[PDB]
Amino acid sequence: NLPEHWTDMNHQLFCMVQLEPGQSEYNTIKDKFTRTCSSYAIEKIERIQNAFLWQSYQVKKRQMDIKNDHKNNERLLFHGTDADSVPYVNQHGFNRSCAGKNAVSYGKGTYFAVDASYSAKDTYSKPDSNGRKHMYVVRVLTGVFTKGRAGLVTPPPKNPHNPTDLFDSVTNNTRSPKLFVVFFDNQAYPEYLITFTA
């Protein structure tokens, strides 16, 4: 059930795995980050191996793939957060109940950025006492999306006469999406933690 290239956790449910520079797995994340954050420097990249979060996320992905009748439902996005939140996110993922109000709100949910530069703002990846900034790389089930609105506590219906048949996520702009908001647990898998500095 767990991915075959994960480290053997021998009966453990959770591990953070430090990646090596020069491995394709490290370099792809570094390249994705540096595309918009070349003024910052990466300290380390850790692969998050969380068996329970993976299981629940992969069930939601299978369900969305069935429902939407295509496999274009997942995006790899960024999430900047404070040092105090990292232990919780590593273990329990992204909790909308703990989410900050975004400077431009498209709904009351968890925000994920297309560009690492957005998540790199001190407002999100708050520097800790040692000047370390923290950004997740996240598999997000964006699915079918529409432009959000500040009042949303769930994605809006696709059709106002069928209020329970929802968009999967919302965005700031459907033609040029730069942020996505999700409103349900296990719709986002924290896959890598980037620790970085100025």
Residues that bind ligand 8C7 (CB under 6 A): 78-80, 102-103, 105, 111-113, 118-119, 124, 179
Site string for its own copies, 45-74 (x = CB under 8 A): -------x--xx--xx--x--xx-------
Whole-number minimum distance, CB 109 to its own copies, in Å?
Answer: 8
The widest CA-to-CA distance across the chain, in whole angstroms, is 53
Nearer to its own copies, 115 or 128 (CB): 128
Nearer to ligand 8C7, 68 or 154 (CB): 154
Instruction: Using CB under 8 A, pick the residue from 47, 61, 79, 108 that binds its own copies.
Output: 108
Whole-number minimum distance, CB 122 to its own copies, in Å?
Answer: 24
Q: Tell me if 98 contacts its own copies by CB under 8 A.
A: yes
Q: Cα(134)–Cα(83) distance, rounded to whole angstroms? A: 7
Q: Which of 54, 45, 125, 51 is closest to 84 using CA atoms? A: 125
Q: Tell me if 6 contacts its own copies by CB under 8 A.
A: no
Cα-based distances in Å from 171 to 27, 38, 156, 176: 28, 25, 12, 9
Nearer to its own copies, 63 or 123 (CB): 63
Q: Which of residues 115-174 bind its own copies (CB under 8 A)?
A: 153-154, 163-164, 166
Residue the block writes with tokens 């329990």:
92
Q: Across the beta sheet with 179-182, what order do the strands follow?
A: 14-18, 41-50, 188-197, 133-141, 74-81, 110-113, 179-182, 169-171, 145-147
Q: Is residue 176 within 8 Å of 22, Cβ to Cβ?
A: no
Q: Which of the choices ligand 8C7, its own copies, none does residue 13 contact, using the CB cut-off of 5 to 8 A by kind?
A: its own copies
Q: Which of 2, 52, 43, 74 is closest to 193 using CA atoms? A: 43
Report the interface residues with its own copies, using CB under 8 A.
13, 52, 55-56, 59-60, 63, 66-67, 87-88, 90-92, 95-98, 108, 153-154, 163-164, 166, 183-186
